[PDB]
Amino acid sequence: TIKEMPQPKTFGELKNLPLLNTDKPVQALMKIADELGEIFKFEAPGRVTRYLSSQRLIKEACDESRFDKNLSQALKFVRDFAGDGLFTSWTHEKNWKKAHNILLPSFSQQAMKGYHAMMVDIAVQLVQKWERLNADEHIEVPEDMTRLTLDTIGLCGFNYRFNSFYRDQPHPFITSMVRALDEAMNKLQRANPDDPAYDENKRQFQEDIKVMNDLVDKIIADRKASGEQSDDLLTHMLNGKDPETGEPLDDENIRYQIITFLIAGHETTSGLLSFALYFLVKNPHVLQKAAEEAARVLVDPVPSYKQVKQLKYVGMVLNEALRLWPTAPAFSLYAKEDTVLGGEYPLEKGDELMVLIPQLHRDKTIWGDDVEEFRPERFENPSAIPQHAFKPFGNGQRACIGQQFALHEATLVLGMMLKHFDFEDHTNYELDIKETLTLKPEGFVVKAKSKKIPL
Numbered sequence: 001t002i003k004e005m006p007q008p009k010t011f012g013e014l015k016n017l018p019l020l021n022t023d024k025p026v027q028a029l030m031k032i033a034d035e036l037g038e039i040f041k042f043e044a045p046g047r048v049t050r051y052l053s054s055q056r057l058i059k060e061a062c063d064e065s066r067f068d069k070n071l072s073q074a075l076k077f078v079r080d081f082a083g084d085g086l087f088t089s090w091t092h093e094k095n096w097k098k099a100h101n102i103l104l105p106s107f108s109q110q111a112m113k114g115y116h117a118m119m120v121d122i123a124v125q126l127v128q129k130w131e132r133l134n135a136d137e138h139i140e141v142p143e144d145m146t147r148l149t150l151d152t153i154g155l156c157g158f159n160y161r162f163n164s165f166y167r168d169q170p171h172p173f174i175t176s177m178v179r180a181l182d183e184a185m186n187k188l189q190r191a192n193p194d195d196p197a198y199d200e201n202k203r204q205f206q207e208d209i210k211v212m213n214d215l216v217d218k219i220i221a222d223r224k225a226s227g228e229q230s231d232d233l234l235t236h237m238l239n240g241k242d243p244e245t246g247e248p249l250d251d252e253n254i255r256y257q258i259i260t261f262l263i264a265g266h267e268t269t270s271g272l273l274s275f276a277l278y279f280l281v282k283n284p285h286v287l288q289k290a291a292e293e294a295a296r297v298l299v300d301p302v303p304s305y306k307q308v309k310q311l312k313y314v315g316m317v318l319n320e321a322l323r324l325w326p327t328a329p330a331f332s333l334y335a336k337e338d339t340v341l342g343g344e345y346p347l348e349k350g351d352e353l354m355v356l357i358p359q360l361h362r363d364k365t366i367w368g369d370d371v372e373e374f375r376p377e378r379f380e381n382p383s384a385i386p387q388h389a390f391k392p393f394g395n396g397q398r399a400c401i402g403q404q405f406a407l408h409e410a411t412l413v414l415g416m417m418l419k420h421f422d423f424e425d426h427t428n429y430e431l432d433i434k435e436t437l438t439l440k441p442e443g444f445v446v447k448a449k450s451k452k453i454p455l
C-alpha cells in the first residue's frame with residue numbers, strides 16, 4: 001500500500017538540519033535509522049532526501065533504468081575544487097563519459113599488474129618504518145596508513161613522490177587538500193552561510209584551491225614539455241582518446257582527475273586498512289588465520305602480483321571490514337522519472353535518495369542476526385551474497401573506478417604487515433570513529449613485534 005514515511009524531529013524553518021550539527025553525522029543517521037526503520041525523510045531549508053537502509057529498498061534504488069547518481073550537497077561543495085572530474089560530474093555531462101571511457105582500462109584488475117611495483121615500493125617503506133621503531137614506541141595506525149595511500153596514489157597517479165615517510169609536516173598540497181575538504185563538509189551544517197564570520201573561511205578556501213591547482217597544473221605542464229612516458233595514469237590521460245567522441249581530455253580536466261584521485265581514494269583506502277587492523281587485533285583467532293595465510297603465500301622478500309591474488313582470507317578480512325564500516329558510507333541518487341519505491345513510497349522525477357551503506361550492511365534478513373560480529377567467513381562464498389546487499393564501492397556505472405586499485409593496495413599492504421610483525425592492542429583501544437569525507441578509527445594505536453623476516 002501507500003505508506004507515509006517517518007521523519008525525525010524538526011526545528012522550525014531549520015527543519016531537520018540541526019540533527020546533523022554534530023561531528024559524527026553519519027553515525028547519528030544510523031541511530032535515527034535504527035529508531036525509524038528502512039526509510040525516513042530528512043529535510044533542510046529548501047531540500048529533501050530519503051535515507052534508505054534496507055536491501056529490499058536499496059536494490060530498487062540501484063536499478064539504473066530508474067535512478068542515476070545525484071550530486072549531493074556535499075559533492076556540490078567538493079566540486080569547488082574537484083571540478084568535473086569523475087567523482088563530481090553528472091552522468092550526462094560530456095566530460096563524465098569521456099573520462100570514464102578513457103580511464104576504465106587503466107583501472108582494471110589487469111592494469112594492477114602495472115602498478116604493482118610502485119605499490120610494493122611504498123609498502124616496503126611502511127614495513128621498514130615499523131622495523132625501525134624502538135621497543136618503547138608505538139604506531140599511529142590511521143596516520144601511517146594515510147602516508148602510505150597518499151604516497152601510492154601520487155606515485156602511480158603521476159610519478160610524483162610525496163615522501164610522506166620522510167616527514168611529519170604534510171606536503172603543502174596535502175595541507176590545502178585536507179583543509180578544502182574540511183571546509184566543504186563544514187559548510188553542510190551552516191544555516192547562515194553568508195554571515196561575515198565565515199569570510200576568512202572563504203578566504204583560505206581559495207588559497208587552498210590555488211595550492212592544489214598550481215602543483216598539479218605544473219606537473220602536467222612539465223610532463224608535456226619533457227615528453228617522458230611512465231607507468232602512471234597521467235601518461236594514459238595525455239595519450240588517451242575517447243573512442244566515442246574521438247576526443248582526448250584537456251589539461252584542465254586532467255588536473256581535476258588527478259585532484260580527484262588524491263581526494264577520493266586516499267582517505268577511503270587508509271580508513272579500510274585502519275579498520276581491518278582494528279578488527280584483527282580485537283579478534284586474535286582471525287588475525288592468526290590471516291597471518292598464517294600471509295606466511296604460506298608470501299614466500300619471497302618481495303610479494304609478486306600473483307601472490308597478492310592468492311591472499312584469499314586477507315581479502316575476506318577486508319570485505320568484512322568494509323561490511324561493518326564502509327569508509328565512504330553514503331551515496332546519493334535521483335529518480336529519473338516518477339516511480340513508486342517498494343510498492344509503498346511514491347517518488348517524483350528529481351527526488352533524492354540517500355543509500356546509508358553501514359545500515360544496509362546490517363540488514364539481518366540478508367546477513368543473519370549476528371550482523372555486529374566480525375566474521376570474514378561470511379565472504380567465503382561470494383555467490384551466497386544477494387545482488388545489492390554489499391555496496392561499499394557504490395553502484396553500476398557510477399561505482400568506484402578505483403575499486404581494484406584500492407583492494408590490490410590494501411591486500412598487498414595488510415599481507416605484508418601480517419607477514420612481518422605480530423601486533424599488540426597495548427591500550428585496549430576504544431573505537432572512536434572520526435568523520436570527514438570518510439570514516440576512520442581516530443587515535444587507533446598498536447605496538448608491533450618484528451618477526452625478523454628480511455626484505
Ligand code: HEM
Pocket residue numbers: 069086087100153260261264265266268269272326327328330331332392393394395397398399400401402403405406407
Ligand atoms: C576502499 C577504498 C574506496 C572506497 C570504499 C571507495 C568508495 C567509492 C564509492 C562509494 C564511490 C561512489 C560515490 C557516489 O556514488 O557518489 C566511489 C567513486 C569513485 N572512486 Fe572510490 N573508493 C575507494 C577507493 C578509490 C581509489 C583508490 C580511487 C582512485 C585512485 C577511487 C576513485 C574514485 C572515483 C574516480 C570515483 C567516481 C567514479 C565515477 O563516477 O566515474 N576510489 N568510490
